[PDB]
Symmetry: D3
Subunit: 152 residues, 6 copies
Amino acid sequence: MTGAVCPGSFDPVTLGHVDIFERAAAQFDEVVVAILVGMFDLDERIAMVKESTTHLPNLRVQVGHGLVVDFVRSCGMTAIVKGLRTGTDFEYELQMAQMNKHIAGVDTFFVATAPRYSFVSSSLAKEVAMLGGDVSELLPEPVNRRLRDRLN
Amino acid sequence: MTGAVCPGSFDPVTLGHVDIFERAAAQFDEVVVAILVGMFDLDERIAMVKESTTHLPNLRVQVGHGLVVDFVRSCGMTAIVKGLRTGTDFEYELQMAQMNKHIAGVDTFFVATAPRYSFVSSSLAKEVAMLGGDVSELLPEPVNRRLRDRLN
Amino acid sequence: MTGAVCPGSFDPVTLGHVDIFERAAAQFDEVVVAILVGMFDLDERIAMVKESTTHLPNLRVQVGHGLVVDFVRSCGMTAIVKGLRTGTDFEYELQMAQMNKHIAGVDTFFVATAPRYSFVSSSLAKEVAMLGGDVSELLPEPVNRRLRDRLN
Amino acid sequence: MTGAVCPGSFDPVTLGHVDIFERAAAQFDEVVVAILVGMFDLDERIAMVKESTTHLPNLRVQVGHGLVVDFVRSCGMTAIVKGLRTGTDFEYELQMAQMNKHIAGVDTFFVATAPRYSFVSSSLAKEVAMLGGDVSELLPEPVNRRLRDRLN
Amino acid sequence: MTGAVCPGSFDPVTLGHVDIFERAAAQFDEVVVAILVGMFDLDERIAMVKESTTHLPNLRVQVGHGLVVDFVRSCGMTAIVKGLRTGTDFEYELQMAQMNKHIAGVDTFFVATAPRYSFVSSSLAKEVAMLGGDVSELLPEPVNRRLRDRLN
Amino acid sequence: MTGAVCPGSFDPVTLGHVDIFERAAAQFDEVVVAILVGMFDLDERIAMVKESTTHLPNLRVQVGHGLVVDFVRSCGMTAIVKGLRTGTDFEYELQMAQMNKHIAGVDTFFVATAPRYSFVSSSLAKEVAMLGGDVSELLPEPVNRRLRDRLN
Ligand SMILES: O=C(O)CCc1c[nH]c2ccccc12
Ligand SMILES: O=C(O)CCc1c[nH]c2ccccc12
Ligand SMILES: O=C(O)CCc1c[nH]c2ccccc12
Ligand SMILES: O=C(O)CCc1c[nH]c2ccccc12
Ligand SMILES: O=C(O)CCc1c[nH]c2ccccc12
Ligand SMILES: O=C(O)CCc1c[nH]c2ccccc12
């Protein structure tokens, strides 16, 4: 039984994130989205991920605390899957990947997000949305709905 | 009628900035320096840019608020011009450039600052100036004057 | 009168190139595509660029020889416009940009290609096309037609 | 049934490669090492990979021709797994990864090699070995044996 | 008489730092570790560096204030030696190196830390140690001892 | 007795190279410029380095063959000093630096060339000089003289 953990704050989840979830879900038996304790509270973040991943029956959403590698090992896996996008601090991701292999033997697999979703990030989406800009093509509809409510 | 916006906080403007202003002014009909709301207050920042750009008759200085692309489109342009220097977070600039094209159709043109001004930044100039170091060859004289006054 | 030169081998021109041509054409009075002396011969390359740029009335195609900056200065301009894509050797582009400013005072403006065209290059398109892969969504139809003929 | 292809020339295979093979083999049901048509001939390359991977029962070695994505799809998989090391041209790997997703829907997962094997590459190992240097701690013993024979 | 300054906050010193100290100590007549004013207080930081460098008789530990280049010049040297690791912001280090040469004529020499210590940093070690992870193989024993005490 | 080797092809030596030689010569007891076996023949390359370094009495020029680390160790040193400029393939330099430490225990120190000489390289200088461009401000006069002769 193989399994990947996709860790993050997901505040909010973007279509870049969902693209990675989909690719992980297609290559591993189970995928766990670990929401790592912002604009939205924990329960909203969970809801937004769930609502955006109903098409992925082997995907599961869970709150995580502490080291990602602890979460991974407790849940019975040894793989982390993370996306790459424009603006990713890859050097820091690499540093963490090597540290995570060192302390817990967990591998990290990096996958590039699709070009169309390669420039969205949670932070930039929020900042642009707060200043009036339309990022709805870059976020799941469950997120757009909640984003709209707050702006109103 | 073509036009470029050069956006930034300009706290203070450096000769790296002025180098870019000069290159934009030579290639576009109008250049607008948008001061985006630090050490110097808004009026000082404006004054320092104006005083340092008297040799650029098609350049105009204006305070901006909100999204740069909104500023650009309201002022009747669709081009942003930004400089590159050592320490520029280019991946983040790229992310913003793609986001800005997405939401408003605005293009961003990047130009490398001259080598002699390639290692000055507003932040580093301030920090070095506060700790006693001489950065006067890297800043316009209007900035040096104001910088000197505060240190005294 | 402002003018940009877009230099390259264009063997063949891609939709990444055309994206840059379009953005240059919208910001400068004249754009000259300089085809710098492969799979297609010079006349085919010229034809493919012309056929792919009929919607750009201020764009002009010309063969170039020697230094780009010489071409730029002889044609009455001082700006080069180049695109950035995934796999661009940007450090080398920067080196050339600084060298070109040094020897001839010519500025180079870099613009990111649209995400959807950010992973095509002339070389990779050819290599993929030769090994059977379908890159037709990444190239102008004038190029696809000629590409098809040779493969047959 | 999940499966990863690890493509390359493997001329010769290094312990950096074997590190990646091991991590792929632990996360996928099947791993296929595709030797993509140098110093060693095809049969030696195959032999060296086989001899260095006897501890990986779900790993299989095969010669490949043409597009990696064709190989992947014909063999019934949709994942490529590639390692990262110091000197990897990651921008080009990213370009190929996006092109490969475009033409065939195949995902590419990148994993960092262990630090101790992060500076070996086939090319550098050969060049150093030819000029007298000892790289035996960076290569499998099956490779060292064959490397020694040729130098003698 | 030649001399290198190795500046930093060293909160705490890591084996990556000690690796660089050792390489500097072997190439310069004197090495000064400048602790630049966190988790540990100044006196603990000093103690931890001293205790970890007893094998380096030409190495000296000193608190520093203000510009590194001022410290360097006052102490009778003109060289800074800094390490590189995974996650180093090298572009910012380069910017500072050029600024430091500009204002004070001081050269900065960069050396890569050993691969085995290439993913430790003071910040990441602390964060991992606080969340329960074992980083003891990446830190001097004098640091491990003090780290253990606080966690208990 | 401390010593640095500055290895390269130096075809021809540039003022970027001489800048690095000067900084090495000021920090080490002896500097050996190792010319590693182009446009100029070995004897011209030697002559050009010598003629450009008469102001550096502790600098010595020598032809080298094989591994740089062999040269370094035979000459009684354990340090390599290399410059960084715009267009340097730093990832490959890092790979070689780690390989060189591995096989022979030799450290490599990297130093940034001055901004004014940061965009010259032997290759680009030659190519620009062949196509008519004036790079004389970027090369020693001994090189300019020889460069002029060949062009005539
Ligand atoms: O950076 C992003 O916002 C998108 C990619 C990304 C970062 N961490 C991730 C974790 C899981 C899936 C995707 C990601
Ligand atoms: O980074 C800098 O400080 C100099 C380059 C720079 C950033 N934003 C800019 C906007 C306009 C002109 C120049 C710049
Ligand atoms: O690299 C590419 O193939 C696309 C971007 C590109 C490089 N040189 C260019 C010149 C003009 C317009 C675009 C480009
Ligand atoms: O670059 C290397 O030599 C090691 C990493 C590497 C490149 N392609 C690979 C394919 C499969 C497994 C590992 C790799
Ligand atoms: O980044 C690190 O933590 C290790 C490398 C490093 C940064 N500054 C340094 C100063 C002296 C010696 C080593 C270093
Ligand atoms: O790259 C360059 O041409 C200049 C920097 C450089 C590379 N190798 C070098 C060796 C010694 C001194 C300087 C250098």
